[PDB]
Design a protein around this ligand. Structure first.
Ligand SMILES: [Mg+2]
Ligand SMILES: [Mg+2]
Ligand SMILES: [Mg+2]
Ligand SMILES: [Mg+2]
Ligand SMILES: [Mg+2]
Ligand SMILES: [Mg+2]
Ligand SMILES: [Mg+2]
Ligand SMILES: [Mg+2]
Ligand SMILES: [Mg+2]
Ligand SMILES: [Mg+2]
Ligand SMILES: [Mg+2]
Ligand SMILES: [Mg+2]
Ligand SMILES: [Mg+2]
Ligand SMILES: [Mg+2]
Ligand SMILES: [Mg+2]
Ligand SMILES: [Mg+2]
Ligand SMILES: [Mg+2]
Ligand SMILES: [Mg+2]
Ligand SMILES: [Mg+2]
Ligand SMILES: [Mg+2]
Ligand SMILES: [Mg+2]
Ligand SMILES: [Mg+2]
Ligand SMILES: [Mg+2]
Ligand SMILES: [Mg+2]
Ligand SMILES: [Mg+2]
Ligand SMILES: [Mg+2]
Ligand SMILES: [Mg+2]
Ligand SMILES: [Mg+2]
Lengths: 64, 266, 145, 75
RNA sequence: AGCAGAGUGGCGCAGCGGAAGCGUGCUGGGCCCAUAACCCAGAGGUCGAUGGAUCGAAACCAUCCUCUGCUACCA
RNA sequence: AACGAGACUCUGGCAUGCUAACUAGUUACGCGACCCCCGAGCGGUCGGCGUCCCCCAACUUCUUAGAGGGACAAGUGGCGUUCAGCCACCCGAGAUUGAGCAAUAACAGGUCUGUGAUGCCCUUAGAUGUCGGGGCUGCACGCGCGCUACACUGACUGGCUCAGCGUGUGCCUACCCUACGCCGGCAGGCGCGGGUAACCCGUUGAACCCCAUUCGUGAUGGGGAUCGGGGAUUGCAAUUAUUCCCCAUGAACGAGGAAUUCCCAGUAAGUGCGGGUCAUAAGCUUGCGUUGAUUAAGUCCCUGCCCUUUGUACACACCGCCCG
RNA sequence: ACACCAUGG
């Protein structure tokens, strides 16, 4: 019930999912072990390479 | 003025709240079982099933009992929920709430003639009265209204503690008028079919045999509802100790009416 | 600073003492704000003291100006009542002279039943306004029978 | 709507509080004095100007819209 | 005549002393190309009448009146 | 092979290169004149301010408007079956300015009240072809396009300093835009010139904005409905108040339920100014500038549209058809 | 990885 923050760097933009095409699929690293990688769904206009912030690195969202 | 022994409600408590504004992702609602720190109920948590219009569930100015789930005891974020209530909780909360409201309005007259420049002296009186009043009776399940009850009947604890002036006046002269008759219901469920012509005197001697070990001055409430019945409202205490006055009383009546001529009831 | 009485009861109406004297006396009917500044200017009064900071003798100097404006050299185009229909005088009706002068004017109109008198009677709009979609006080009507 | 009570000229208690509030503040604007005291605001302006005429305060910026002061330019 | 229950918006009703709302109806509007369903605004109150307690009631107490069910059914 | 798309025509953005200008200018000095020392100096000279007056001085940067020039996905790097093309970047005034014009087939769309375009029907001297008066404005109520507001990111009172598109004496018809002087608080009045217009109104002294003063959270000095009294102009005539000015009266309204409209960069919005109608005269509309954002660079969810495949008992075409 | 969507001078 307590987890630290994690900071990921965007490495690729996949597509614009969501029902109105609002959120964006993105693949991130983890900036402490660059081996890790997940797919996340962001809400603003991501570019490439900028540092997101994850409040629960364990999830991995898979659609809209 | 604070309602209870803790200013911030704890988790898993049911609270009386007056909804005030239907938000975009919740509703901002007042707090009425605790002081008016805001509360936010999530819109995902009004009802367990799909809703046609929110005004059919909640609308500004409707007392309702809701359960808090989480709270930042520091910053002041009272997270509230309505899916998670049984209508019994509503009862056990609303009755104690309507008790606490009269205790609030009663502990208000002292500030009329005593210092009232600050809402904090209300807290001053609150910590000396309500905290100690419920720190005892909360083990079996009773509150400070029960203490004021035990007081205005036999005034014995208000003296046992620090005594005020004119506040025991506004205590009793309000409670024992709102603590007002607990109506009695014991009547004489006896059917007799008389066979004695001298019996009009038997009924009189049995009326004077109504309540035993007692006097000929204390009044009794006779009712002639059925001519073959003899119905009485006995020694009027509270409907809590005149039980034997129904348990044993009718016996002398039925026997003395049965002894004369012919067999009778019991 | 200046902790003596403030409120004053100028003729038949309670002039609050707090507001600036200009905006203080406007609580009199018939006396708007453009007329009040002229009255105060011709009264020589300072225009940076509230109603509470005037003694009992300046206020009479102001009253007598409000009542007799024509003679303190306030021109004949400031007065709200001009060539008065019944007698040719020019003056400012002040407090209940305004009520009675409106009352008398409506009576004067209705008496000869002019087209305006009847409009004041029937309670309608007296100038030339359309009335199909305006005013609109009454209650809704339904088509059901 | 309520009744924000305000005075147009001081009473002795409030006048004392004015001549003693000067150090207590690092931000002296007409609005804050009009709210912490029960001052109309056209009175707070005059009182602040009066104090400034006594060198008790230091004017840091005056504009047509907003005015400010400071504590003493000391300490 | 008696017992029990009830008397609150046009109508059915909720309302364990800090005090007027719910379902439906009426009037109007929204949605649709229209109409029903569905959504929202407004009006409508001697809380049966009379007194009393209470700091205060529609609510508690007392008297009376009016409806409903059931026996009593009574020169 | 033909049409539509595109090409095209107008417009906005760039030329210190060309053509050439008392109906546009600038710089210079020929000037001169005014004024201040404002600085060297003293006051002139050295200078500073000039929509002060000149030049038969020099030129075309600003102004005007003609001919040509320029931009092509042309260069460089990625992705492309190495095609058609897409993405980023360099140089640049600019790497997507805004409009006009528009197909085949249709609709029982609108218009006989634009027409001396028009078939048929009607009325035709007691007229359905002219003058005087009234109406289109009538108010219990339902809706639509709008204007002004609910104030302090404000209202009032002074002070300061900036535009662009335009129109202007009327052919019957009978009227135009206004300078400058004087009179009146104001609307307005009299007098005497310019303009058929880059020539005069006019350097179009526009509002918001900008700077300084009063008010103080109060339906208040916010807001300006409704109503009383008076004074002018237009016209043959102003009452049911044409418009306009002054004193006075001082309502609802404290950011608006269910719903729902418009919008992507000099755009939304705020702000004023010309054209149309116009004897008088915009809360309209058509254009013009002026201060100038937040959010997006997407999708097919909702409402719709285009192309292919598929199903149909529909073809007046799902607002269809049809069973008890 | 399916709430409700009837009718037509
Ligand atoms: Mg072009
Ligand atoms: Mg150009
Ligand atoms: Mg010049
Ligand atoms: Mg060209
Ligand atoms: Mg290439
Ligand atoms: Mg460049
Ligand atoms: Mg184009
Ligand atoms: Mg076409
Ligand atoms: Mg036609
Ligand atoms: Mg024809
Ligand atoms: Mg004719
Ligand atoms: Mg005619
Ligand atoms: Mg019309
Ligand atoms: Mg329209
Ligand atoms: Mg007209
Ligand atoms: Mg216009
Ligand atoms: Mg004109
Ligand atoms: Mg016009
Ligand atoms: Mg029009
Ligand atoms: Mg296509
Ligand atoms: Mg097919
Ligand atoms: Mg087919
Ligand atoms: Mg068929
Ligand atoms: Mg059909
Ligand atoms: Mg159908
Ligand atoms: Mg349908
Ligand atoms: Mg049917
Ligand atoms: Mg049918």
């Amino acid at each position: 019930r307590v987890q630290p923050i994690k900071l990921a760097r965007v490495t690729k933009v996949l597509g614009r999912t969501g029902s109105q095409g609002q959120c964006t699929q993105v693949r991130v690293e983890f900036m402490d072990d660059t081996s890790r990688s997940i797919i996340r769904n962001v809400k603003g206009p991501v570019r490439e390479g900028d540092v997101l912030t994850l409040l629960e690195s364990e999830r991995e969202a898979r659609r809209l | 003025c604070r309602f209870y022994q803790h200013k911030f409600p704890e988790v898993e408590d049911v609270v009386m709240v007056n909804v005030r504004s239907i938000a975009e992702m919740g509703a901002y609602v007042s707090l009425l079982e605790y002081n008016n720190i805001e509360g936010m109920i999530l819109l995902s948590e009004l009802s367990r099933r799909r809703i046609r219009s929110i005004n059919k569930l909640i609308r500004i100015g409707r007392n309702e009992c809701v359960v808090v789930i989480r709270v930042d005891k520091e910053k002041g974020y009272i997270d509230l929920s309505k899916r998670r209530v049984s209508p019994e909780e509503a009862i056990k909360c609303e009755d104690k709430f309507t008790k606490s409201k009269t205790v609030y309005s009663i502990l208000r007259h002292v500030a009329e003639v005593l210092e009232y420049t600050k809402d904090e002296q209300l807290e001053s009186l609150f910590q000396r009265t309500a905290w100690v009043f419920d720190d005892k009776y909360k083990r079996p399940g009773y509150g400070a209204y029960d203490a004021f009850k035990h007081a205005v009947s036999d005034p014995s604890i208000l003296d046992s503690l620090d005594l005020n002036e004119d506040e025991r006046e506004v205590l009793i002269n309000n409670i024992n008028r709102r603590l007002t008759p607990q109506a009695v219901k014991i009547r004489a469920d006896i059917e007799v079919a008389c066979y004695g012509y001298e019996g009009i005197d038997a009924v009189k001697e049995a009326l004077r045999a109504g309540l035993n070990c007692s006097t000929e001055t204390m009044p009794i409430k006779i009712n002639l509802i059925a001519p073959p019945r003899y119905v009485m409202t006995t020694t009027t205490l509270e409907r809590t100790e005149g039980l034997s006055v129904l348990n044993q009383a009718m016996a002398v009546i039925k026997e003395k009416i049965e002894e004369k001529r012919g067999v009778f009831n019991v | 600073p200046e902790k003596f009485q403030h409120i004053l009861r100028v003729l038949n109406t309670n002039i609050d003492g707090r507001r600036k004297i200009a905006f203080a006396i406007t609580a009199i009917k018939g006396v708007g704000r453009r007329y009040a500044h002229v009255v105060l200017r011709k009264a020589d009064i300072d225009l940076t003291k509230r109603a509470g900071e005037l003694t009992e003798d300046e206020v009479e100097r102001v009253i007598t100006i409000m009542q007799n404006p024509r003679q303190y050299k306030i021109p004949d185009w400031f007065l709200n009542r001009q060539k008065d229909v019944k007698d040719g005088k020019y003056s400012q009706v002040l407090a209940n002279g305004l009520d009675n002068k409106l009352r008398e004017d409506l009576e004067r109109l209705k008496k000869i039943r002019a087209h305006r008198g009847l409009r004041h009677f029937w309670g309608l709009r007296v100038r030339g306004q359309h009335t199909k979609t305006t005013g609109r006080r009454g209650r809704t009507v339904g088509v059901s029978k | 709507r309520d009744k924000l009570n305000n005075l147009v000229l001081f009473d002795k208690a409030t006048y004392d509080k004015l001549c003693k509030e000067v150090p207590n503040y690092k931000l002296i604007t007409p609005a804050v004095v009009s709210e912490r005291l029960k001052i109309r605001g056209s009175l707070a302006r005059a009182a602040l100007q009066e104090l400034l005429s006594k060198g008790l305060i230091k004017l840091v910026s005056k504009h047509r819209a907003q005015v400010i002061y400071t504590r003493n330019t000391k300490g």
